[PDB]
Design a protein around this nucleic acid. Sequence first.
DNA 1: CACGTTCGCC
DNA 2: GGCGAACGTG
Length: 169
Amino acid sequence: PLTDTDRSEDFLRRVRGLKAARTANGPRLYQPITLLWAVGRARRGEARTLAWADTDEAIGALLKRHGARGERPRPDYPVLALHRAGLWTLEGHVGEVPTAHGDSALRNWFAEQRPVGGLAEPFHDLLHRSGHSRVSVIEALLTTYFAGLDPVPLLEDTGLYDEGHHHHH
DNA sequence: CACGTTCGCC
DNA sequence: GGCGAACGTG
């Protein structure tokens, strides 16, 4: 039947289908940092959704510490991309949600709308109860986004080190 | 500071 | 093209 394994391969295919903006030597880290943050919060049974102010500040902090490809603290980018992929719910806003195309209008949209948000339930609940799904998604994110980067400090800020650190010695 | 334009890429 | 994005250019 439909298992957490299949739910996990579904999530992973959806995560792999994301298209992050790319730098000269790799992908920008907005989306994996946002995903990894939600991964940790799901792992701990934290509240799925958060007001925008807390989300802005939590993801902003992770972007400033661990934005190793020149990321500026602008969670509005990854949240809109994740929302566009169906991976991130936003509520409390009026009208449709913009794409992550542009700059100041996106920042302003969150300032005015202040949407209630978080990673979508099927994946939140899945990540809360399945260590398998968490490990699998962390390793897909670290492989794709953190080649040539030290992921450990961001694994510690998300509470995922023991699931993101594979042993190789 | 804020907007319109530009870059990289499926 | 469209979107995830940064950046002149006033």
